[PDB]
Amino acid sequence: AWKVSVDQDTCIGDAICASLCPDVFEMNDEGKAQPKVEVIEDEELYNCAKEAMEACPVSAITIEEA
Amino acid sequence: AWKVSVDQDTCIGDAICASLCPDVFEMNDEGKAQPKVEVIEDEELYNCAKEAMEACPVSAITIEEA
Ligand code: F3S
Ligand code: F3S
């Protein structure tokens, strides 16, 4: 399983992650992204998370495997 | 790039990780594993880190992608 993280101190609210993967990322009341789900096992969702991580212009997103 | 982590509270010093991947894991003075390197970009090393993560009998190891 994978767990996504959005560094709130890095994120500038570009939102391309939420664009690419709205099932995994949502905007919060500070205009930053955060994960909508606390675990991913679905391969398709994992793949769009990785796409979002690769696209963030400020490198705010990380993904952990266990 | 990837970063390994070994939860010191979880690890019981089984050491199969160090067996499978001695370039990535070493034993420390408390009898627990820890990462020898702070970053992996080599695919071979990543692969044997993932093998070690899948083999740990107590699930002490995790790997983060950025
Ligand atoms: S700036 Fe923030 S809103 Fe998404 S694309 Fe990067 S984590
Ligand atoms: S118990 Fe510890 S020594 Fe390695 S195989 Fe698991 S992290």
Swiss-Prot record, chains A, B:
Ranges for domain 4Fe-4S ferredoxin-type: 2-30, 35-66
UniProt keyword Metal-binding, yes or no: yes
Gene Ontology MF terms in the entry: 3 iron, 4 sulfur cluster binding; 4 iron, 4 sulfur cluster binding; electron transfer activity; iron ion binding
Keywords: 3Fe-4S, 4Fe-4S, Disulfide bond, Electron transport, Iron, Iron-sulfur, Metal-binding, Repeat, Transport
Binding residues for [4Fe-4S] cluster: 11, 14, 17, 56
Segments crossing the lipid bilayer: none
Top-level taxon in the UniProt lineage: Archaea
Xref: Pfam families: Fer4_13
Subunit structure: Homodimer.
Protein name: Ferredoxin
